[model samples]
Target chain A: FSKFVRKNPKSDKFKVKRFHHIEFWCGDATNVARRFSWGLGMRFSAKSDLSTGNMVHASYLLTSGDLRFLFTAPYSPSLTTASIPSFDHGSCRSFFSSHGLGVRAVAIEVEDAESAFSISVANGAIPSSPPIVLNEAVTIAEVKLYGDVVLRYVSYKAFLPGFERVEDASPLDYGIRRLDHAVGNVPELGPALTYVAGFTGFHQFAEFSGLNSAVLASNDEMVLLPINEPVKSQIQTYLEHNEGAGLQHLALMSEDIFRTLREMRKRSSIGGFDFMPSPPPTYYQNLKKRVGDVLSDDQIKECEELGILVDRDDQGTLLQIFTKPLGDRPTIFIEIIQRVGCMMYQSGGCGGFGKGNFSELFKSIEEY
Target chain B: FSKFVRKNPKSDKFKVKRFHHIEFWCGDATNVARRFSWGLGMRFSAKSDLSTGNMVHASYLLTSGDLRFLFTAPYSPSLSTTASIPSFDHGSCRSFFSSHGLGVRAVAIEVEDAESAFSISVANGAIPSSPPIVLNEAVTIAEVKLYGDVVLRYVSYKAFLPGFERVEDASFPLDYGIRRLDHAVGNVPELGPALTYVAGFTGFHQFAEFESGLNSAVLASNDEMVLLPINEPVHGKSQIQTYLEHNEGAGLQHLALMSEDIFRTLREMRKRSSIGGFDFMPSPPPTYYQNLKKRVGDVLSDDQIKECEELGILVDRDDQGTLLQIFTKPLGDRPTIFIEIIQRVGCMMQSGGCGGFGKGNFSELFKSIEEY
Candidate 1:
């Protein structure tokens, strides 16, 4: 519940470099992909489907800057492909039935997928899929995470081998640059973090609130994972609605949050993204006293209008906003964030996890 | 196959007045509802979900003119509703999605009497999915199984179903000229057996039959108000067979929506395609347009034909009237289900709307889809 300092790891074996892509396992891939493409302003970049000779499932790859999101849905169970019997069609359907539209995988870019799998298994991680090299260079492996979700380790820079390039003439872009972190809700954060750190060698990040939460970062601090356990708050609500411990939200980093929010708000209509309710007016009225003039008066006013929350630490300031749950179940959502001033090596740059705004964000969802 | 003539039924005990709505069982009901709302220009009319205390499933009602489309998705199995009354369970919806991805699950028919419709269909060997139950004084509903997990819903509802409340904030100004559903096409394993079963239960008469590597038969209500076209794969691998393979079994193939002017409809829908709307199949060959006038013979102007060629609208005619139609690409990931927009230029009679399923343009349309 207080700031916990951590020393850097001395070893770099099987290191996770960055986030490769996040995949959502849902029922309708086309419409869900369009929701990300049109609503979030991500470009539809690639796909593997019946047209692309992947008969097991249909997957669409969307990208914005370095952030990639893949949506996949299995074909009818009777239709199977002998080439890829590993893709469990029945299990995919069960996941959708249990979790609705939820994240199935959070793939990480690693140095070596084969070594990552071998080391993780040796360190007490349950293996989901062994490392399989595709197209000679692209290697992919998986390990079971909480519930039906998996932590995938992929070593590749280009698209997967089975995917074909999607020709989008006017691909939508909202200036989102990369994935900052991903948060998961679990029953107990202690065992979850212990189990993850046992295999992946992740360390505790700086700062924690009294909400029974902990943020874990990779050795290089390039990948952040915030795990939350229920204490009769929004996290409890998510675990109940999601049926088990699963991904709660993804934090997408943006360069200029004002412009990014403006573009996203333009799509906040029928069939587009909907945002959470804004914080109370007094929170903005006392913003300068708490954060101390990090953002300009005009920038703060614009943040108020766009429902963007601002906070700062000694390093720098950060601005963020939350989208309402992406599906009907109020289980998974998105966070758009922009960091300033703190660009040092291995630092999350400035505002650390929006600790000051945790109470405010919780109130927003409760009031909604 | 050729056209077959048949006598009308003497009894009108359980006449299906018209199509009340078509419901699709999908994984994500919210997004699929938006696909119909924003892509097909349908209005988001009503909803029944968590907000309304429907803990078992979520359903959305979309309407345009007289056409209504309902989309429903079941909740997670862990939270299955404990209510005693029977509603859709998570297991059934998952099974439907496994059998037919994002395809029609029910074709609801507006009947004069729900009890009579249910009893007659059941008496004639229709398997009942649910018995007739009255929601209130104003609404009563029942269901009977159709081909391949599909159902025939008989409803005598005044407005929408009981649980759904009207969505008041659903006002939008975009109209793509679609009026009502003209017909719905289905693909099955065999044509004659399915046809005999459906006709025997619903009392629909055989209107027409045609063949082009796939055998098809059209069945119409006694008053010629509702049309249902059934197709079965013949020998070779045609689009029908392809649909069967991808969809895994018998299912609804496409919905034909009637428009006043297909040119305006296609133009407006095309303009939205660059955004989040759907895209149509590629246009037919230029020779198909070059021989347009001689084939349909000036039912439309040269400028109209030019617009048709540019927009990929197929033109056809019979002794009754001219039909202008176009097909959209599959709405889902699989190449199984799609939509067709048709404009009946002159035929408005109760009996003589025989543009006959675009028999002349079948080969060209098949070629275009196959190539894609």
Candidate 2:
């Protein structure tokens, strides 16, 4: 009903175009990549490993629609943390050990990496990795996001150095178009929010319920980042289990949630989840009373069956469902989202970022 | 061809009943278990981790027929590997994952008594990795060093190992017709010494020995319930040498899973491979199949022979029976470990497995992989 978000002044030096790719630091990239390929419908795109001449670490790049996920892991203990240029003294091993599979970097496709780095550093963003040109086509730079997480700035071209293309002979299309947003959980919200807002010129998008939450978006609104601090809830559990502040979950945009979840749920163990239990029957009974016929009765029934949550803004309605944690740890998870009749930028609708239903999602996690 | 095997006296202290499980020390157990479950149709059986109150590591237990595979990985670098075994040094498992990538860490055998087995093996020539430790009333476990970082485990248990919670809901899409572990092949530095050291500890007999590009000797228990085929490099640039170098030293080479109907299993495996499963090596040349029917006369139907040719299943025969087998590419990034599907026809249990370790098919199998 009521909302508050502060729009920061735009940065003249650089602008974030869109999200390029999200990278996960895993213990085993090959198997983890296959897990995504079999579980989700991500197709293998490229790789960097011992076979590919990267002796220090192994990386597998996977893609679905416009979304790119790069999984990297250490190759040998002989090479220390110094061998890897990114992050700090704690290498991939420590990173993976400290936090089981997690998002190491959230890469943004920026207009100019050099300018982005300069402006971010000027605005008090701690430089994590210096600018480096990859394959002579792409420039990549980094700044510490929080708790060993890095916000990577990648220039126009999308090629990753040392990675060779992989022809996925059999690729499945699940209609997951791109990453809608990435949410991070930190111990304190205001400092982390201000640091990101100051560095990237991302303005506050909205504030939501369930563990003091704030949404930040790029000027163009192509990327929406929700920052959450714990209030004796799942965010606290993630901060403890993850060993520190880190990426909490990723919302993958889908054209059709019904078809996507339906296809994903069929694989069962292969899909690596039994979804969270549905909201109570009373919640379903009062669905129209709350959202007011944004969804039909049959659609609501389908939503209940798939455990999908429904919400709406003035412009349109939104449908989403959360998966169980991706790994053994109770830290990282995924959200499948479909928005109708809205863009993320415009004020009128943009299918609001689940502000209406985060409390319910948080309650389910508490029960779990 | 002629074959030779030396029979050793059986050990009096304890007896190895059957293979209890095969464990892979991986960088990630959750995802790797899914790889096997989705690829080979192995059902998840049990797990141990933070949820199970075992904070040092995470292990996933998978099963197909009588076979049980345990995939284990460290929870954190700061945790101790001693939780699993006393002398097992993993640098918290980063050392193992870095050196070998995803490789077999242990091959456990069910024994009459784990303490007795551990004592006897240590008294013989095996180096002790872990002393006997009891998990519960029904389960006790011990370990001894094998090749490279791999260990030979002695376990005495009635059902599943303790410290693991049974996964009641884990299921696979389809059964791959796999029954049990047929044989596990190891690659060592020398044939005579490796075979003698293993035989000295376990009191196993030399079931069969052959020489092709490499020297291979098969060792087995008195009941023939367990079979270990060991290979040593004979000359320059061989498959065994490739495995040794990639593995960083002597270690497990491959595991053959027995199939009730190999044709059906291979078909199912191929169906998974077409999507995202383990991939088999290339097929043998036309001449290898053109002369298959003549070598093993009518052991395989003409239609079965055609299926083997299509599915890349290798075939061989001896005076006792016929052997059908296929090898997959390296299971991990390195060419260290792989899986094999084998079917034996007209073999007897009283005698040693009559399939003969597929020596006749080695040349073709080697050629099939050497090119790769």
Candidate 3:
């Protein structure tokens, strides 16, 4: 393990195992989920609405391999409470208005929400709210993360109380496997990194100014996090458009970039996709001189044709690519990545991130 | 011809031939368009977004048959003069985030001279707004107020007006065989004056009037072009009045799409509904279909009758012919604007023209709407 991440001094009770699910509050939960079902090949898993007695709102849960996304929307603005509790519907409404349907909260599956909340709060993290138990189904707690986003600690259960599980057959599978990392844009990186890495036994896995990113890795090496800030000299247009700090992108893992990009092209061909511009041809030319000889001719050629990017450390090579912004604002996008064979240590070959790919991304984003 | 719609006063000055396009100022144009494309089988035709060089806001134009719907949304709250005019973009950004992702803003009517059209309508007590203007060299448009926030617009063409180009990104076919827009239905305070408003200012005439406490009425052009079926509260708590309240004011209540073969359309609709995607309005009771079989025994086959009941396709007829129609569940979370599919089989003439059979459907239609 990296020297930065150490065993919790107080206790080992608050550690998280893995990401449980991601939830988005949206205008239409079903519509957003359908887009993922059609665009990303996610299988529909569960739904909660008026029929299911989730009277005030509706929700849809979709899954792709090990990753899950839950979308919720309040159907009625006229709903009333006993004394009109201060659950401002206006906040969600404004959030949707500012940013179209996008991720708002990411929850990590943990053994104890109580210990997680206490540990985070004890570590200088702002408490989003006290831990709440819902009808004996599950207990969850939240803490404020960068840009109005929330970090939640959820205790595992079959499903949330209000949701009904169902087997919704996916139209097709696009070969997407699991989530690799989620990137966030911050007003400044210090506050977010301090909260995420300061307390959680996380360490800086990578850092670069030209790329303007700071990535943190867990002690277990099961999760990777990348955080970005709006440095004037770098790419900050997304922060400008989304108004301030916000989620930048989500990266999902693929076993084979060739298989993934090919099927994505087919899945998107029906709904039409505006794929992000890939690395320039010269980048591929240099890649051939750099490491293309290590890979098969077909592998290098396939990566070039699909615009996939490659960065290698002594340990392994990470193949990656990006999708165009899903909405009009160009605020949030998707990143697809795969780790090829590379060596470890002395030649950590540039294993952390593809910092060399910044100039290309910076140039292309200007066109948006 | 109806005497009220007699010869135009000045060389047939201004006439609206048909629906050009319906514009909706929404919170998310692309998302709403996707729902319609997938659920209702509408084809995406054109788009103007950040990617398409429409820097101010995004607009998606979708079509099926002769009907067109343009959905627009501002990219951000802060925008300049070149942005979409305030007439379309409401000041309160969160307004569109409500139960309905949007509401009908303008129903653009097909016309040649928008300037003259505006003058003629304003000369007759109509409230003019965003008067005749040139959007592009090829497209001239004008807007005027109708009953609620809804406006009646004048346009030169049936396709996209200006600043819109074709978008073929998601090139999947969702053909539903919907031919043309049948009519746009609205809910107003009183039916007569609203009908009179369109007739006096615009070139329209009341084609048919339905009884049952004078709850609903229909108006159309002299050539069977554009049709308007409007409703008002008749007795206690009429469904139209309920829509007015539920919608927070008077606005578009529903739109009817004419289908060439309603069976195929309804069959697809059923499949979509069965998948838990979109839903249809509460169907008629078993008795309604049971009685329908008795009345139209010789006209329809047992298989046809069974298909209608199994799929909730309602049938109504006059001496002229029979009409098959069905209502979709409200488009949004509430009972705001929905869609209706109608297939007409005419037998030459009618007691109230095409509306006579439409009128016959009201009794059962009202019952269904009441339950929903």
Candidate 4:
């Protein structure tokens, strides 16, 4: 277990309401969203609004899968006419240059609407929209991080259901089990982690040996963390080289690991989607023993064979698997994990099994 | 001909260089390059050095076309050693977010080495890479533009066969012709057009006009102008809502048209790629007349069928038939004209006609796609 530290804030500190939604600036939002649906076996819902120049934003709420993705594009008035000084080139250019391509706008759910705005403002997060009422149900505050990325903080009396609002119903009715995790790439490891810890009241969850660390915070129903990996030591080297900082990846949960992976692989091949390379056979051979009696031999063997990682504690175990980068840059990818009963969700719990697993897995990936 | 204005060394400073290459940020550079090649029938050339703990960049030059694309990724040792970050999540509670998605970095191209750099610098173009001697014969420079777009300026000292240079060759041999034009979208129309006009000496050729009085620019070598369209009118009503300023469309000259409509449709598609939404029929109706006796009808009927257009341009003429056609967009999803002229090169010049000739074909395109 890791040591936990709680920051006792003064009476005047801002309070967070809840997490509303996260937005991403992509080359092709529609295509990226569709790829997410296909990889996770989730239903894609389309939402069309006229206020933003008759623009259409498509969303998919992965209920059973534990994720949601919103894909958007300018449809009618064309991108040039809707938003002045278009976001594609002007926004993306500045973002790529400054943040090395990892830049994106994000919105956090806070307890008090004003607190959310205040917190973001104090943190130097540029305010794009300030506490605007979307409708009767919810009010939103938008902030721009690093100028290129956009975020919307939502507060509402009633929560929105996942599948109830989708316009088109497909066979893939995967619902999000819950909120997973959010990841980020930073240049300086210490400062970045400290900033996140101070701002979000996040306690250090796990620390990688050299330069990366995962800090976690919980708000009633959901857990949020800033997974900071330094540019030199983290996977962001690939991201920085290809694109810049945007939304890097998302992990979803699946009830049946075998069925989900099998179906995902099939669909990806059919759709011409690019996925990460599978781990080698040797990984399964060694994992059989490390698992010991924590899980049935069959379960361990199945996970290893399928490139899934297994983590367990006294409570229960969870099965997790990750996909390769989906786009041209390494900025975004997807994860699919099935929790049996384990309350804690982190890769370190499973990655603890040791070298043979990582070596075998990374050796195959290096070729890619 | 447009009036030529002499630039004063102190007042109207200018620079000269040919466009070279564009670069992008991709999650999987190799896969994206392969997909682009397949779609454009272009070939991937050599891969860039990925040894550093920094980003990995790759380059692909058009084999039969005149374009090059560079894809980059920042997969350093540092990020890989840490815990992989998930791609999505809930608000406060965090699980492991998955990783899967792609984003754009910069669009770049080759240009005249020294002059391109100096001129772009004077015009406030950000220099990403200073001109460096890559080898004994070649020098390169990189510029970052408004939309994370990158332009690579390169110059070759020695005269080599077109396809011989390994670094310059496309990954595959495309069946299409040279690149025709690139399109761009903008919010403030005046700023967008002004920016292109300011850099017009960098091979900018003509301007295009639509019925709506909207205008676009064209490059000198049959390339489309730095196209600009307003997102919102002065009244704040949306004009081209689907696109935002600075967002680029895909290069328009790669998509191929059927052989039958090769000539006529090519012309219309060229206009569309230039001016946006010029009508192009997949095929001409059988009732389409073939007036061979007149100078326009001297060529084969297939050629004649292609020459008729609502915009007054002729797709076909006497003597030879046009074969395959394709186009590329700027970075968005528009189309431009890149045709495979199957017949011999001198056919147009050999036959005598007033309106439908060689220089005339491109001259009209210049008038259509660029602002004179």
Candidate with the greatest lDDT versus the true structure = 1
- Encode model 1's per-residue lDDT on A1-368: one tens digit a residue: 54545466634457678888998987889988876777777887888887777768889888999999989888765553422223677778778877889999998999888899999999878999888887686888899877778999888644777788988687688899899999999988888988887788777776623348777787677788888897648888888788889998999998789989999886666566779878877767666676656777787788888988987765667788989888778799999998877555536634777886777656545544
Q: Compose the digit string of candidate 4's lDDT tens values, residues B1-372.
A: 644232212221223333344444443344445444433334555454232222222233333345455554433322331111111012101100001123233333334454444455545544433333334334433332332222323343322112122544422243433342233223333445444543443433333221222333322222221222222223322333222222333211212212223444344334322111122323322222332224344344444434543223234322332222222333222111122222212334322111112322333343435532
For model 3, how does the per-residue alpha-carbon lDDT over A238-282 read when each residue is reduced to its tens digit? 776777777888887766778878877654533424477676666
**Model 3: how far residue B254 lies from native, Å:** 2.2
Ranking by TM-score: 1, 2, 3, 4
TM-score: the better of candidates 1 and 2: 1
lDDT of 3 by residue, B254-296 (tens): 7888888888888776666533336787777766676776767
- Give the alpha-carbon lDDT of every model: 0.79, 0.77, 0.68, 0.39
The per-residue C-alpha lDDT of model 2 at residue B252 equals 89
Writing each residue's lDDT as its tens digit, candidate 1 over B39-106 gives 77777788888878877787888887788988888876565443222446677887888777889988
What DockQ would you assign to candidate 3? 0.26
Best by DockQ: 1
DockQ class, candidate 3: acceptable
Using TM-score as the measure, which candidate wins?
Answer: 1
- The residue-level lDDT of candidate 1 at B240 comes to 87
Query: Which candidate order results from sorting by lDDT in descending order?
Result: 1, 2, 3, 4
| DockQ of each two-chain model | 0.56, 0.45, 0.26, 0.04
lDDT of 2 by residue, A1-368 (tens): 75544454544347778889998988778778877877778888788776667766777878889989888776554433222346342467678777888999999888889889999999989998898775567788999998978999889654475677888468777888889889999999999988888777776665323488887787666778888898658888888778889999999987788988887888767634557877876566667776665677888888878888887765667788888888877888999998877544533226777777766555545554
